[PDB]
C-alpha cells in the first residue's frame, strides 16, 4: 500500500485504519527507499545466484478479506463524514432561518 498524489488520493483516507491493525502503509519516498535497498551490492550479488522475491507489502497479506475490510472502513468513514457535514448544514440552515 503506497500513499501518493494522483489517482490514489481517494484511497489514502483508510490508510490510518488499516495501519492500526499492526500493518503499515508506505509513502512514495518509503517505497523508493525499500526498492533502492534492492540495489545494494549484497542483494545485487544475491540476485545473480537466486531470483529474488522482495515482499515489501507491509503485512497486508495477513488481513483476511482485504477488499471487504477496506470497503467497510471506507464506508464507515464516509457515513461518519457525510452525516457530520449534513448536521452542520442543517444547523446552519436553522441559524439562518
Amino acid at each position: 500500500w503506497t500513499r501518493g498524489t494522483g489517482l490514489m488520493s481517494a484511497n489514502n483516507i483508510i490508510a490510518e485504519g488499516i495501519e492500526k491493525l499492526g500493518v503499515r502503509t508506505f509513502s512514495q519516498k518509503e517505497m523508493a527507499f525499500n526498492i533502492l535497498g534492492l540495489l545494494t551490492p549484497e542483494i545485487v550479488q544475491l540476485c545473480q545466484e537466486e531470483p529474488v522475491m522482495a515482499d515489501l507489502n507491509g503485512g497486508l497479506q495477513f488481513i483476511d478479506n482485504l477488499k471487504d475490510f477496506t470497503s467497510k472502513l471506507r464506508t464507515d468513514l464516509l457515513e461518519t463524514a457525510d452525516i457530520r457535514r449534513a448536521v452542520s448544514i442543517e444547523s446552519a440552515i436553522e441559524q439562518k432561518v
Binding site: 448536521v87 444547523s91 436553522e94 432561518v97
Partner: protein
Amino acid sequence: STKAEIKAVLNQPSGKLVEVVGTIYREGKPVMEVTSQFLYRGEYNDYCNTFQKVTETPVQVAFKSAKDLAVLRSKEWFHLEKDVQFDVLTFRCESTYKFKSANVYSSIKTTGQVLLELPTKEVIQVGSVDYEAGTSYGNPVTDYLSRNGKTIEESVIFENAIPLSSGEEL
C-alpha cells in the same frame, strides 16, 4: 353551543388582521371549527398587542437514512419521548408567535407532538416537543418540518382543468 377563541392579531400594512377561529360544541364534542378574519383597514404600529398562535398540521418530513437520528438529536428543541428507530416524522404541532415589528418575531413558543410509525400497523400514544426563542425571523421547528417535506397532503392537484357547471346556469 358556541365557543370562540382569538388566534392571531396581526399588524399588516392593511391594518390589524383579527383571526377568530371560534369552534362549535354539540354537548362537548366539537362539531365545526369556523375561522374568520377581520381587517381593521388602516395602519397600526402597536406591536406589543400583536401575536399569532398558529396550530400546525400533521406535517410529514421526508427522510430515508440513519443520519436521520443524528439530525433529530442535533435539534435542541426536540426531546426524546419514544423508543423506536427514526426514519420519518408526521408531527401534529402548534406554535405561538409574538411580533415586535413587521416580520421579526419578539418570541417563539412551540410545544407540539411527536409522531412516527409503530410495529405491525398497531399505533398507540406518543410524546411531544418544546421550544423557545427571541428576536427571530422564523420558527425552526415548523420550517424544518416543512423543508423536509409537505404535510399529510391528501390533495394532489389534477393535471388539467375541465368545466363543472360553467355557463349562465350558475
